[model samples]
Target: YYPPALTGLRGSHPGAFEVAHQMGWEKKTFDVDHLPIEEEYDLVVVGGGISGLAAAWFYRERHPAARILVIENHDDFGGHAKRNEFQAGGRTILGYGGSESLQSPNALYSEDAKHLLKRLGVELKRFETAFDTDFYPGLGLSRAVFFDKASFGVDKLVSGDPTPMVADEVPRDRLNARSWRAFIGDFPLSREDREALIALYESPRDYLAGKSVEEKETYLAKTSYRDYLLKNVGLSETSVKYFQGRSNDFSALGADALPAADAYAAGFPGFDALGLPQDEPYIYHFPDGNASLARLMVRDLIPAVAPGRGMEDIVMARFDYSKLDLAGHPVRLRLNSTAVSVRNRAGGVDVGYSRAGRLHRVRGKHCVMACYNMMVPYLLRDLSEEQAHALSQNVKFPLVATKVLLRNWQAWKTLGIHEIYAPTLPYSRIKLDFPVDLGSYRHPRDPRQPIGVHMVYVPTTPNAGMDARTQARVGRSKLYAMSFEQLEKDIRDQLQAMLGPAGFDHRRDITGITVNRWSHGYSYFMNTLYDDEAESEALMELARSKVGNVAIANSDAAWDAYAHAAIDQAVRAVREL
Candidate 1:
């Protein structure tokens, strides 16, 4: 009955997305006016994500006795804030199935978002102690890069973490002598390629020798990072290929689609040599990622869903899914219910959902379409063609976050690596789980203990010569077409190849596998090279425009995928009511 415990295919799993696909692809309509009304609600939120749950919480905070119904197509309630629970060696281990962490809470988060977490008893200061930053380096585990035979002629695992570990915290610094000069020495490239790469990382040569500051800004806005390296920095094509996967964690794109200035901000190499400010130490996180945040929100919204209180106990607390939609609850979250029809009423809203192979109807005073931006056009019938087009403009990137439990991490200790970045392979990134121990849940500190390894795969059609959204649409299809069996084989093969030198065998050491496939992964943001800056805001405003009693809330609404933005959008949408 629990979704987190179920292995094999997950996230946009099997039954979750088929109805929405049929509704969007087939243009088949469901008439529900004749269906008997089950119940009325003060507010009906179409998604049970962090934003949807936050909407219910915000509305309930305003109305203590508010009757809210949150309908989610998935069996689980947390939307992309999914949790994966596994039993390894008789221990209940956890991993993030979807959204990960409250990113940069102290610096990047808004006041409303911070206040919302504060209300949920999330102490930002607690993570300082919870997350053991030195755990990886304290042991001999360093970060490395694995070059596969597919792109490189031979498979090679190079030592050294490389200076620009662009996306993650500096987990490789203390253990490895991370530098351009020393790192390129062992790299499997031509002498010229290695020299050019080293020079790019260390050179002070101004690529824009004759250009003004404004001119450089304009140039960077128009030029992709790939062109900057090839045309300006004069890096060999082989050298440039090594850095392709650096943007996967942030942009979910390759160097061809990522803008140059954006790479500078992301601390990609060559720019770090050009004197950019350093990144702050990011330690704030729950052991199970933001799924704990979603669980906390659910607990606060519906106390009956789980026992105990506050963030300290949330990691180990078991939620009663049956209690989620029980009668008399001020807020009820209904899972496996896909909204087939949602339209604004003269005074309120009328909604219909497909559940148990039948349609159910309900009327509500207000409705918040917190689902993805693309789903809004198909679900909400009252939208004009203009609004539909604006909403559908966002094409989300696809990602596969595969978590595998090893019987023991002795092999990793023998290899002396904690994280591995594969530039030319099936998975772009693979690393040990975040060393976060909160409450009674303990993380793997001993090499003999079972540990979870997290791997990330960007389902991209590389060098498609298309914009980010168009390529993601193609990537999305390729990812959805992959079966769990095929995906699992790749996972096993990749891990065995990388960890094999240390006498690791996936068949004997592997305990569990869970592939969290998000076909509609990251929300689309405006690409400077593709989208018009002046027109981007115009389209976003129109896309999130309120329609009578219906308002919109999601990461898509704000065009930002961060947790704070999701909460802020919910606050904004509820304020509209």
Candidate 2:
């Protein structure tokens, strides 16, 4: 319950997946029927993330006194919505691991998701004032692009990133308030390459001038962004390198695997002349990102587990782990328990799980398989062959959200930048955590105060021409194989190379590091380049379709990496039950 305070290699931390791997990968069978029933519940949820918690919340609406049990594989609840914390003096600095923020709640969120947030006391308007949008630019800091020597033959920071990130975050016309001429002029590329980039940014003429709208749509959807840039847009290989990992944070893959249309939607350059509307602004956030939303859900489910009422006090709210799984409570969240199978009985369902090397069964009137869609097939072994195959196709993109605690922000201020987009590096995006002041939870004001910074790493395979699922599988394996020490060295070395010039010391200035290694990171979005829309939709429907008395939830069920999708799926799952 106090998981936020513990730092180091987290997310899919060791013991969390050993049992699942043994059962799924090694084909280990367990004699589950012989195991005595541990408990009986009205609803048994097999994932203690936002979906499972939301399912319990939605179910409780109909059956107020339902005895609910949520089985989770992780040591802590809130599956992907994880939090990390660092203490300096009397202040607490929070960082997010997985789901970062409530994205586009005002425009895109469904009614069910909105209702949940409303009940949770999340005043969306409060965020407009709470999020300090002007904090960085006010300090004369701007977006920068770091060119590492290995990739660019020099270690340099170009003080303007000429692309859209968030609608409100990045400047509108002249990106980062710098002219395209000035921005492109600072590049380490050859004169020809710089001119190509400048033309791509400034004078973006119709590259597909003769093609009709339908033809353009079909071509962009079918073609990879990298291919479009090289073959059609006429950008050189060196210019293409600048936009390599541009879509990693949004789509979990680089430009090579991303579709041309999707890349355009994500605000990448070269398609500005296509006349597409920009992405909506994303400002909703917590000090610890969406993890605070998870904490609020847990508090609402069991008030005794934590203190505080709304978003203001939630950041500093302390939770008691002992109160989470009390036998007397109507809703109990069981951590470090992996569900092995969900066998449909005569009238109800039997959920068999492994906890501390012991097999335990729980009889439930209804079951919600709100875990990873890829693991759902392993959990529910009795599903039809078609359903099982569909479930197995969910290949989640792996990512790392590493948070490094720095002693001070003087380095960033001196460097005149708070964020850097490094295309060909282990960590693609590095920036300061969102600046928000709510309740007594204050963000760092003085450069002398310690702060938390986020580093995003999408471990894509070198060969991007392969299928997206294949790429994700390889990335997941490589992510798991890496040790914490190796990751730490990379983090330290990267920081030294980028910030060392600004008098930042890797040895002395660094205080702590938390590597949130999410091997099963983003819910696999439908890649237009590799996936057939109709076929993928059919598979997703079959994968998440109701099975007997059991239902499925999670962002993966919708094949979308959004909190809103998780909530929407949770609502559907409970309604199905």
Candidate 3:
């Protein structure tokens, strides 16, 4: 039997070359074509994850006498911590939430981050004030009180299981029994309530009876922050919706698996020693989340970077964003430029990229890989057998978010809470609504408005390709990747429910609506962290050697993704290399 001898650029051997050829991707004959390999630079950094960038920074620091060239597949750096920006409905939206905010500042991060801030003379004012600042425009409110509480909960400020609980114990593989129908069928409740629960879960499919493919997918749209509430959290019907899906889509399993409360309980030192929280009940965050921080970090590397304003000192928050290419280093960075290929040459690696409809290659001593783990399979040449298998074994993308930002929020002024979170929901990872100082954030001097909104989506098994068997059991696709359009559409649908007609109809009051998508954002970490040992190590070593003279430096290889770990890994990998 054969699987149609699958062709084209999919999971096939020579994945990189095949995909390149299919796209008509060719190598860029660089200005230094005649340069010998050994004479190239001292180090060639590839990819642009924080780790890789860190590697470049460290390499530059250590070998003050070497030349370094950083090659990234993305148009911009920051890798997964990348922030995507777009314009829609008039306002400028930071497509992805990026980086939210720093937490539990410790010597490990405090030292480096603070040092960077000091060097730039950026004030290290506690960001606590930023949290209390109001930013929602839709509801016309002044603050994001509801979410402040949740963030507080996340910060261990309040009590109770912010990360609602799952259904009563069941055998590990028996989650299939906890289907929407089964869950509702087993609950002894009023017909209306039971029917309502069934309806909510079945909304995606219309019903959960005989498992129609569409219905199953709708039903199993992945348990979001909102859905997790109804399905798992013991909260009664009325209260459940409040916390389910609010600002963003989130997976309870991932959140619960974080190390928030435990870190707190064990005391500050315990928290510091553990580095970043790995597996906790719920790891709540925003898209403009981490990337915001990355933006601050990268700003340091750019000369004369800043807003439209004149030269101001480069602080962590005030670091000049425009300075990224002030002089536009020899390593000029152009957004939207994605790397397509790279091969070893006489003196160095010939890096290739698809930019402005053309292939461009540059010779460098070494390359650094800082993108997500899955990308490793595509960038390297003659990827090792172990590298191929390990990279492929991870079957899920965890849950990437679809953030829906709203411009105005005058309609919900009367709502009970400013912040909303649905631990689980039928259509989103988590439907989170938080007021922002949209005025200050989007346009620093504008008046504060309650219309600002940031809806987040947690990672989940994507909706790409799910077989009948798997679909039948889980009721959703096992593969999922989010895009801005998907988030906007879903957010619009949900907004109608939360904001009513007048709110929905008032287009002029709205400034922006956007969706930020992340593919292969989080590791599909279900089993032990090191399950893909061979593949993981091979990729690690390969990254160290030359997958294109690039190295892998990210939390992807760690037990779980964490800021410090990614930094440490980047530092260690580069040092050894």
Candidate 4:
């Protein structure tokens, strides 16, 4: 039975069901017979991700008269910024499964976000509002909490929020002081400290062997806590579960979550790096979790765009946004249009694209390849052996995220917890949730559907340091060829376990599920913060030399994961041109 909302689409956009039926079919490729000399353009951008969009927008600003074309393989302009909408699910309660949110602080605040916001009239709010900043009450001052399993209670030194409560704010200092010692007495230690002498007096792993469970936990409870407990604190092999999973997820360590010396070569400090007694050390963050600050820039760059006015209005990032195509004028953004190939021709360059099983061609003077470093082998013809190898190996990382949309609020209430954070989990060290009442729209209002998108962090790791041959194998087998069903299953299992039974049996609770699969979402710079340095400079030079007319931009070239880095990379590429 067709739903009322989507029944209208059956006639408006034909072949919708046919396309969905062929979703899992393998992708096909073709080689053009001859370049069409009749049509041409001044500039052509490949891919519709933030990088490509930024490059196209930047070029448009410098040479307003130049004709430009942007080609993408998807139906939308935003690559990783893809959102989820079901024709049958009433589509109104949209949930973006892939990349979401963007921030300015700690990211490249290129004035694009602010300028665009002024035009969009989103109103200047905290960075969190612009991007996805989930509150980590565990890390917040005056509002953090640690559990004491033995006492069957939680020590309330901090409030349910992240802010810290000062001693003076308490009615009684003695009552509130509840020193670390007293707090642990109620919670008890995870281990009794037998055979842990190896970390206590010798290596950290050895000295922990001699101390009792209480003594070892005392050391572990400190903010400066490291995983040295396995050796020194005498935590048994079986008991040392539920530690920070992000280490392995980000390739900082192995499945064991143990950092090898090689992991340290990137210049990241061990447990000590997480600054203790003060702000955690070497803290790394981009503008916001979605890392799409660049997208905001692109939207705000165009002159006529505005907020909530819908897509017709041009909302730019840095430069004024114009709807002009190669001929110059407002054009409905063409997404999901893939540009196959481009090369310098008679008066300009020839570009080819394939859409809806038909091949089309265009001409352009210049072209930019703003795709992932790993995908370069298939697209570029000029990169040197070393340059290509370095880029492929250096700019690769695992892209994983989890989105949990709920239709009910009873789960949170039944758990007797407003928040739950495992600073150390088996995989990713992150979790977040919101009450159904917090929804902007009423829960389950879609008749058959309810709620929007909320999520928890997923775990993944980059397979770097592999030789050319090995890396190729890793890319081919590990991600690119994997099925979307696998990701969906994994997300479902993880969310189910995390939310427990109350969230499980309720059929109405989970009305929808979508997984955003990205093989190369962000740059995995590893323990090192990936700031553009001397070696990076040399690599950039080499890359330019190999492909003089061609340029590549990704998140790794800039510090932190954000839209600013994407814009910076795109802006840098346009300058080179």
The parts of candidate 1 lying over 4 Å away from their true place are 165-167, 171-175, 272-278
Model 3 spans > 4 angstroms off: 1-42, 65-67, 73-75, 82-96, 107-125, 133-288, 307-331, 343-347, 394-407, 423-450, 458-487, 501-509, 526-550
| Candidate 1 local Cα displacement, residue 326, angstroms | 0.9
Q: After superposing candidate 2, which stretches have Cα over 4 Å from the reference?
A: 166-176, 274-280
Cα lDDT tens digits, model 4, 1-577, are: 1111121111112322122223213323333436454445566777666777777777777787666667666544566654344322443433343444444333435665344334443343332232222222122212123222322223222223221211111112212223433333332234342223212322332343455655544444331212453553445543333233324333423324233222223232232332232211111122122322333434544334324232112121122223422234322234435554544445454556666865677656677766555455444544568876656555444444444455654544344333333323322422232211111322232212344334433333323433323332354346544455665565555445545544444344665554444444555443212223466656645553425556666454442345556666777777767
Q: Report how far residue 329 has shifted in candidate 2, in Å.
A: 1.4
Per-residue lDDT over 1-577 for candidate 3, one digit per residue giving the tens place of the 0 to 100 score: 1111121111111212223334323532223234343224556555566666666666666666556555554445565564544344554444333334343334335465455445533342433233333332232322111222232222111111122222111122322224556545533345665566565445432123455554433333332333333453333454433332332232213322322232133221111222233312121222245554455445544434434221122111333333443232532333334455556666456656554555555556666655455555555555677665555443323333444334444454444224443334333332223222321354222333423454554532222243212222232133223233454555565555444533454344444543333334444443211133465455445433435445556656553455655666667666555
lDDT of 2 by residue, 1-577 (tens): 4777888888889889999999778988765888788899999999988888899889998799999999999989898898788887677888887889888787888999888888999999898778877777678788898998887789999896655674345435424447888988998889999999889877887788888877888999999999999999899888898888767777778888989888776667787776544455456878888888788899999889988798898888888988999986899999989999898898799999999998898889999999999998887867999998998888899999999999998999988888988988988899988788876787787888899889998888753568899889999888878999998999999999999998999999989899988899888878888899999999999999888999999989999988888889999999998
The ten-residue window of minimal lDDT in model 2 covers 167-176
Candidate whose lDDT is highest: 2
For residues 1-577, write the lDDT of model 1, one tens digit per residue: 6777887788888889878887888987776888887899999999988999899989989888889999999999888889998898788888999787777677788888888888998899898788888888777578888887777677778766655543355544575656778877667888899888878767657787777767777788898898899898888788888977767766788888899988877767555433333444666778777888889999888899889988899999988898999887778999999998888777988899997677899888999989998899888888999999999987878888888998999888887788888876768889899888899998878788899888888876666689888889988878867889999999999999988888999999999999988888888998997988879989999999998899999999988887788889999999999
On a 0 to 1 TM-score scale, where does candidate 1 land against the true structure?
0.97
> lDDT of candidate 1 vs native?
0.84
Instruction: Arrange candidates, best lDDT first.
Output: 2, 1, 4, 3
Runs of candidate 4 with Cα error greater than 4 angstroms are 1-33, 85-94, 103-190, 193-240, 248-334, 339-348, 357-359, 416-453, 456-485, 526-537, 544-546, 556-560
| Residue 84 displacement (Å), model 2 | 0.8
How does residue 36 of candidate 4 score in lDDT? 50
